Amino acid sequence: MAQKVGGSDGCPRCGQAVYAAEKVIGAGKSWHKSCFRCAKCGKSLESTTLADKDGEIYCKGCYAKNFGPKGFGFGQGAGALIHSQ
Ligand SMILES: [Zn+2]
Ligand SMILES: [Zn+2]
């Protein structure tokens, strides 16, 4: 990790370092274009659909796919079991 804010930029993720610069960033990490790994939906991501924090990350694939948490799946869960069933 020499030089700052561009110019030679390596990848803590795959354990390679980049010269052609495929470097992204989050918080103060740096990644490849194709290493960005949401550990929230558990998915390999896309380029510009991401969200960093601290030194981990979840995805704008996620602030997308779950743009609005609440619930969905037909049934509720609290129906008519009534304790004992
Ligand atoms: Zn990488
Ligand atoms: Zn995600």
UniProtKB/Swiss-Prot annotation:
Name any GO cellular component annotation: focal adhesion
- List each copy of the LIM zinc-binding domain by range: 11-62
Q: Where in the cell is it found?
A: Nucleus; Cytoplasm; Cytoplasm, Cytoskeleton
**Domain of life of the organism in this record?**
Eukaryota
Molecular function GO labels: actinin binding; alpha-actinin binding; metal ion binding; phosphoprotein binding; structural constituent of muscle
GO annotations under biological process?
muscle tissue development; sarcomere organization
Q: In which tissues is it expressed?
A: Most prominent in tissues that are enriched in smooth muscle cells, such as gizzard, stomach, and intestine. Lower level in the heart, no expression in liver, skeletal muscle, or brain.
> Per the UniProt record, which residue ranges are transmembrane?
none
Q: What is its main location?
A: nucleus
Sorted keywords for this record are: Cytoplasm, Cytoskeleton, LIM domain, Metal-binding, Nucleus, Repeat, Zinc
Subunit structure of this chain's protein: Probable monomer. Interacts with ZYX.
The record's comment about this protein's domains reads:
Glycine-rich repeats mediate the association with the actin cytoskeleton.
Function (record text): Heat stable protein, that interacts with zyxin/ZYX. May be a component of a signal transduction pathway that mediates adhesion-stimulated changes in gene expression.
Name of the featured protein: Cysteine and glycine-rich protein 1
Organism equals: Gallus gallus
